[PDB]
Protein: Actin, alpha skeletal muscle
Organism: Oryctolagus cuniculus
Amino acid sequence: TTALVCDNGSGLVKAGFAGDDAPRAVFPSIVGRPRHQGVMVGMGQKDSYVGDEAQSKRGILTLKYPIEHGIITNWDDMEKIWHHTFYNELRVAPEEHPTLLTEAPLNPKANREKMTQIMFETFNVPAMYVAIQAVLSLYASGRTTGIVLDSGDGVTHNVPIYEGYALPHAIMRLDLAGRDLTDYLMKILTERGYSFVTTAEREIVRDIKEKLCYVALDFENEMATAASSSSLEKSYELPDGQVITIGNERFRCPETLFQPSFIGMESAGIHETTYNSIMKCDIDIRKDLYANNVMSGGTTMYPGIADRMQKEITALAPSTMKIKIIAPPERKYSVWIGGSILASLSTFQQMWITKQEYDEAGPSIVHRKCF
Amino acid sequence: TTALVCDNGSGLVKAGFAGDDAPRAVFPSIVGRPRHQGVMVGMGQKDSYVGDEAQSKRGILTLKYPIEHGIITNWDDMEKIWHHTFYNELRVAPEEHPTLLTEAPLNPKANREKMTQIMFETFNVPAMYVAIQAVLSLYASGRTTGIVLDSGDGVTHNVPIYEGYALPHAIMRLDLAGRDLTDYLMKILTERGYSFVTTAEREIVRDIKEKLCYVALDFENEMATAASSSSLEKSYELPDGQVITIGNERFRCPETLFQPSFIGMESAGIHETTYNSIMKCDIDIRKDLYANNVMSGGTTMYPGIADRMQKEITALAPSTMKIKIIAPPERKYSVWIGGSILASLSTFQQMWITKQEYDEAGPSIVHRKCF
Amino acid sequence: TTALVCDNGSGLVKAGFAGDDAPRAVFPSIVGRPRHQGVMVGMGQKDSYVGDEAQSKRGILTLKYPIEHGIITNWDDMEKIWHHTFYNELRVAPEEHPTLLTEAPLNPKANREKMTQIMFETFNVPAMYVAIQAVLSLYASGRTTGIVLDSGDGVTHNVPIYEGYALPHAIMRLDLAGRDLTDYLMKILTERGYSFVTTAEREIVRDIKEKLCYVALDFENEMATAASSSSLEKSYELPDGQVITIGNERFRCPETLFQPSFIGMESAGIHETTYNSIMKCDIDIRKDLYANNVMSGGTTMYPGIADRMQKEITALAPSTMKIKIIAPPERKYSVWIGGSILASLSTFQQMWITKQEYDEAGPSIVHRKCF
Amino acid sequence: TTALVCDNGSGLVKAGFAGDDAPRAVFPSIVGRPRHQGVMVGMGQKDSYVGDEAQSKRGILTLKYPIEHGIITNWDDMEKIWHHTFYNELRVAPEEHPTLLTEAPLNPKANREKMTQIMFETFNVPAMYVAIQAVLSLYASGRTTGIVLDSGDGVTHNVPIYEGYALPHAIMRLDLAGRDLTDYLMKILTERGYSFVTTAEREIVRDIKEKLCYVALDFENEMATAASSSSLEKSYELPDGQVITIGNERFRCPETLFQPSFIGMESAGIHETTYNSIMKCDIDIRKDLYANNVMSGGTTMYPGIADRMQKEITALAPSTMKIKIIAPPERKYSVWIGGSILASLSTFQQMWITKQEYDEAGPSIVHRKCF
Amino acid sequence: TTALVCDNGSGLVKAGFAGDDAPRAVFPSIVGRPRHQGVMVGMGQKDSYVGDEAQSKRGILTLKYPIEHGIITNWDDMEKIWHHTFYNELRVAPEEHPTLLTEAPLNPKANREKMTQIMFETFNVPAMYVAIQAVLSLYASGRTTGIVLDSGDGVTHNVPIYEGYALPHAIMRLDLAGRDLTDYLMKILTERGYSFVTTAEREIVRDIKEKLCYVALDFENEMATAASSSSLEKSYELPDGQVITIGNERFRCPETLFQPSFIGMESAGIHETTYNSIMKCDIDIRKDLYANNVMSGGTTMYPGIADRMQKEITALAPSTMKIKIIAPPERKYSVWIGGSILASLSTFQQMWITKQEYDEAGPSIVHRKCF
Ligand SMILES: Nc1ncnc2c1ncn2[C@@H]1O[C@H](COP(=O)(O)OP(=O)(O)O)[C@@H](O)[C@H]1O
Ligand SMILES: Nc1ncnc2c1ncn2[C@@H]1O[C@H](COP(=O)(O)OP(=O)(O)O)[C@@H](O)[C@H]1O
Ligand SMILES: Nc1ncnc2c1ncn2[C@@H]1O[C@H](COP(=O)(O)OP(=O)(O)O)[C@@H](O)[C@H]1O
Ligand SMILES: Nc1ncnc2c1ncn2[C@@H]1O[C@H](COP(=O)(O)OP(=O)(O)O)[C@@H](O)[C@H]1O
Ligand SMILES: Nc1ncnc2c1ncn2[C@@H]1O[C@H](COP(=O)(O)OP(=O)(O)O)[C@@H](O)[C@H]1O
Ligand SMILES: [Mg+2]
Ligand SMILES: [Mg+2]
Ligand SMILES: [Mg+2]
Ligand SMILES: [Mg+2]
Ligand SMILES: [Mg+2]
């Protein structure tokens, strides 16, 4: 029975079974192919590496991410990852369980529809349902009210929910996200001669970022103190033993989330995106949202980012509004956790879209709405 | 002598001279600033683009509209546009002529007062008068009786006038207008992967809308026929040569005017706003208003919108009431045209507020009433 | 008065005076040292050969290029070349003139800073300014808009500029360049027994390349026709009189620019690097960039390379976009020419960084931005 | 059935049958001709001695090596040696078996093609395949990852292989090898009056080298200790009974591999050639290569050479990188052993190029790639 | 002051003073001892004849040459000749002057060291320096670039020098030289009954050779014409009045230099030795060497030898290479002349090895290198 929860994000694939409080399979949504050599099978050499093994043999592969900015672009590779997810990672035969999928709001309708088709035809998934990540994030936090600030790898978005009701009219979405932060950092590391150009190296820079980068509480001030050599500098050991010294970049990188323009992004920073979404909501609600900002996973894992936003939102908001940011430990899996909850949830059972229904109605059925 | 007619709307600035039957200067109320680069003058690089040149170099500018929802918010940029209007567009020295301004009803009093101050101090305008757009619209149509339905970019409003008398007690005003329609359309275009996020792209979407969108006579029915691929689909070529295919959005966008809730707007659709305004009028007048609905400019330019409202008002009204909607060609400049007429009108001459009077009485003088 | 223009590239040093339309001193950035013998001075034997004399006596020297991939690595030898440039080549006493330097974008900050220090301390250069090569290239072409495709010896890079504004957010940079092409060719010449291993021989292969190699319009097709002995074969006389016959290599070498993977380079070919840089620009600009691609110097000197890219970009671009590649004669000195123009340019005068300023502010001053 | 493994090197010919763990025929690739006398057959005097008999009667022959620097130069004599190999040494009729040949990387294409022609036409070899020596060396060591350092008689080369994939982009090749070491030693022996000038004597010096020479762990230091008469001196008995005393030369000879310049070679020593090849590989691989350097045969047989390189590579590498050099006993036949393995390998069977295929496609067929 | 120049060759001793353009003492390096008689002093009969007096009384002496193949073998007699050189020939007291010695390249180190010891201990030579003959030969010719072809009595050798730099890596050395030519000729004269077996007679044959022998431009052709009695025959009068007729031998003798094998020499002829030495040099140099071959003394005095080599080198070389052989009159003293120049040369002064230095450092000091 149970159910599968598959948070097929743009960065990491988080899969597991309903009822568990943690993902069982967490691995990079990556399909790698022998960068060079051509590679005739000959003996038995495969030309396809997925997830952890692509990381292991990263040095000979060109790594691709099927999903870009929250949208599945390379469907062949996407299908491949799902295949791998079920059989090689979870070790489960798809048709045993109904599957709960997730996605970012404001995606192309074809994203849902094509994904749906595959679930029902390639994997023969008894029944399937695609939920919105923001909703799930609140379930994880145990809230019915708040601003969900999702921000990881491909997509950043804001969803206002009030006492169980979604306020779709104020959804915000940015391309700013972890992947942009990574690439920005690559560009910045170059300032010190640390040239990174390969997809392998990009991947390394992701690892650098996740170890050293953090959010400043006052970018300008801290940046100024960085003029003096100090604790702001911290080293990193590369795979080949070469040691890197990181300085300003350690906080300049994540700062992009607050100052978009760093990468040529025209939009406003996440604190204003959040604030404005609240401004687009009814005045009787605004207060409740101010005291219940809920950070999801991904890039919200930077140290001190909660405090930084608390500061800036407080500045933007009215002085009597209590600004409080919810940013629990394990929020990196917030969506997946919510999925587990929802899937195990009793009444939710009626929401499954059976293959039967799909065959009867066709693709359009996935756009039905209900909690 | 003559006079200047300056229909300083929220979307387009329409300026010209009294007596002409068409605006001489029609350009976007836009102030653009180099999105990125910082831009030290250095050689002679300016950091300020207004109107047509902001459109021309749109790709490197962050475009701002000084006016929002009919209210001047960025006064610095507003002043700048007026400067540009007089010297760069009309090529006229302000102090030569008295100036006729316009605005939406129910604006903040400070809007009038601050605007007034600028006219008299920055531009030294001999004498100035601020009229209400609805009144002017009827002058353009040659009517003394009717419901003026103004609806363009920032403001939609209803004003009942009967045989030369204004009925201020039944004025309606909505935030629904062209700019909301544009942004809704952006949100909807996303359904097909047509991501538009920049102010430049917003501007493009405005152009899309103005070419392809039209009003359905029966939204539900037409929307249903759109299930079959047909003539409802129509393509559009983007600035970079990429081709867009528009389907449902082609009529779903303008439909928002009839179903507000599409963008989270709580108010009733324009056909009910109109109807209700008539209901708030004396029963002896109602009949005359029913047969004389006058559409102003802006969004009333959508194809078939007159017929659509005729239908719905007919449904709302009594069966014996002849419902007739006046929606002349060139109504996109209705207000401006009326301004030209009124300014050239003999007796109107007494209405000018001289700088002398202003200096004697102060700001409050602009709230005097007379036809 | 005047000014010195010193395009200190990785391959050739191009120096001259502002106002001239051609470099006065063009010579190889090479420092050679007696390969063997040890060489005690004894009588008066020097152990240091720079530029043309290193070429002349190439046969007994190990030739080094101080600059690698656009970065100054051997600062001692770099200083030496500059010394030579001023006194032995230009025959000018540095302190007479302000100096305009150039470099590739995305270099290590220390490259600028150390270079700066030397100018002010070793050569006592009154005032100095370091410009970006791409900007200069457009000046040479007389354009304010276009994609600069720089590609010579150490660095290939793409810079988008629009109507005087730089779009730094879409700068691309590759290690692929002339030096890699040379070394690839060495590796390929080996196929016919033409073993080249010395730095002297590398230098010869550079000369081979510059005489015989050209860009195919259809690599696959031409390569196929090369199966038949024909005009594709062309001979070359080595310094010792031995005659070489070149076949496939004549176009396989430069083809690497379009197919990176030939040398194990992971990145995309220059036509996609260019295209993608344009894709990273605002959609309102893209069109203007498509019709204004500007090839700089270096490797763009291969025959037919303009036509080849025109073809491939046309394939990549939308069918309505007019693809036009600007690739003027004398583009091999494009940057230097632009430097001459800019240095002579009136308003530019304010940009000089005086030694005074440097002493007051310190190294960081060279990162100030302005046109 | 089985297969023939013929490691036709430049020094020794190693031939045997697939499945054996050792060569059956190991003899010098030498063709000797009566140095003087002219030699009319008369009675039955032959003018051609091959291999062991050329060594036996070395004193009256001018000895030639058909192969020079890995390239077959004297094809007539090459054919002769192969004839001898099959009939006089192995005692096998060629057409019984498919033949596995080997060669150094980066050879002239004509080397493969002409060799191929002979196999199919002179010897009528059912099917034949030419493999690269480096690959075979790893098979012998049982590894799928490592740096193959091949260095014997005519060719020294470096090939990086990672988990079954070849990284051709970082292949290095030097002319430095055993034959150069021999000739250098001849030149050096002259210092003590030991004049060796004949090809016979060269051959003797080869034997001297193989008995006495070894690699210093610290050349400078050891060389200094050699100032004192000691155990560094060791004697050798010549064929005529004359006794030689060897001193410094005992380690100065092999030192050339680390200091090229000793013989006027411009290239870097083998420890830097190795290191640099690793530097040309992806950073995620480098570590694995550092701990898996695999020495092939030939000159790697010098005593302590593994330890010497371990030292110098350790100096070059990062301190955290575990440097380990694999240099097994019997590595002098590494390639041949690998050949035996590969030939017996099941799936490899498909790789044979049948004479049929050759006749159909022609010479070019030998450049097909597959494992 | 001045200096002594002592070209202590294997055939003739050429001694004189620095600054002179010709040797003052030129005499045979011969020590003769009463062949028979025993010779007790008795009255005052000496048992030791050196140089000219050994020639005068040649008929009763067994003549020995202390030097063989460029190596001093009989040190007792060597010392004796030097004694004679200084006191009996030059008439100078050694200690008055510093002494410049010469030797062939690739000699045993003990040759230099023992010679050195004697200079400092037996003759108390203030300071001494041992130069290489090839270098000196170029000084005589006034060149800094060329192939020195030295070939006289004991040693033939090739040294490449380029613009003041020695290229030791391509030095060639043969035992073929005048003494071998003499002995070959003795063996050949026997064909006509002219038996020569004594050292006295050997000496006569040397004189025959120097009068009649010459180099053929086409050995085969000329040899064929010698079938007819002609001008090729030429007579010689022996010391006892007996007349010799020389025919084929007149050119067969010197031909050995081009065809080594005539005396059982395995090496290649001097034209190939020269050519190959050039081939071992860098390709950028080869051309300069081709046009600057410099013949030293000794056997290069044969008539037409320059033309003969020009022919054969031209055949070996590329058709575009201008082959030019420098073979000036008085080249028989080339080395000595160069010595005079160098010794008088200003800067050279620093090169003298003082006895002081020798006593401090010991023998090894003579292997220091510098020009
Ligand atoms: N400790 C960390 N600090 C900062 N960012 C992190 C950290 N861990 C992960 N990330 C970022 O989050 C991204 C993926 O997180 P996730 O929320 O699972 O993305 P998605 O749901 O879009 O797949 C990573 O690619 C990385 O950029
Ligand atoms: N052909 C058209 N169809 C539909 N809408 C239009 C058309 N032309 C203009 N508009 C809308 O009208 C807006 C401005 O019209 P206008 O009445 O001048 O506005 P305002 O008076 O508020 O400045 C435009 O921004 C656009 O949204
Ligand atoms: N005729 C030519 N054809 C092709 N490539 C050329 C030609 N001339 C020069 N080059 C290449 O351009 C390189 C240097 O050009 P340049 O643009 O001055 O380099 P840089 O500015 O990096 O110093 C040369 O090293 C050579 O590789
Ligand atoms: N014990 C030894 N020590 C050092 N070098 C050796 C030894 N044995 C052989 N060699 C060198 O290896 C050379 C040939 O080895 P091999 O690897 O078979 O050469 P190739 O494969 O090129 O024919 C010999 O000519 C000799 O120079
Ligand atoms: N005219 C000549 N023709 C040919 N060979 C000569 C002539 N004169 C001298 N030689 C040869 O040169 C030899 C010595 O010349 P030289 O160059 O001084 O020898 P070395 O320098 O070795 O002492 C003589 O022994 C003789 O063999
Ligand atoms: Mg996510
Ligand atoms: Mg209006
Ligand atoms: Mg350049
Ligand atoms: Mg081998
Ligand atoms: Mg001599």
About this structure: The interface with chain B takes residues 71, 106, 108-110, 167-170, 175, 261, 264, 266-267, 280 of chain A (CB under 8 Å). Residues 128 and 173 of chain A are 26 Å apart (CA to CA).
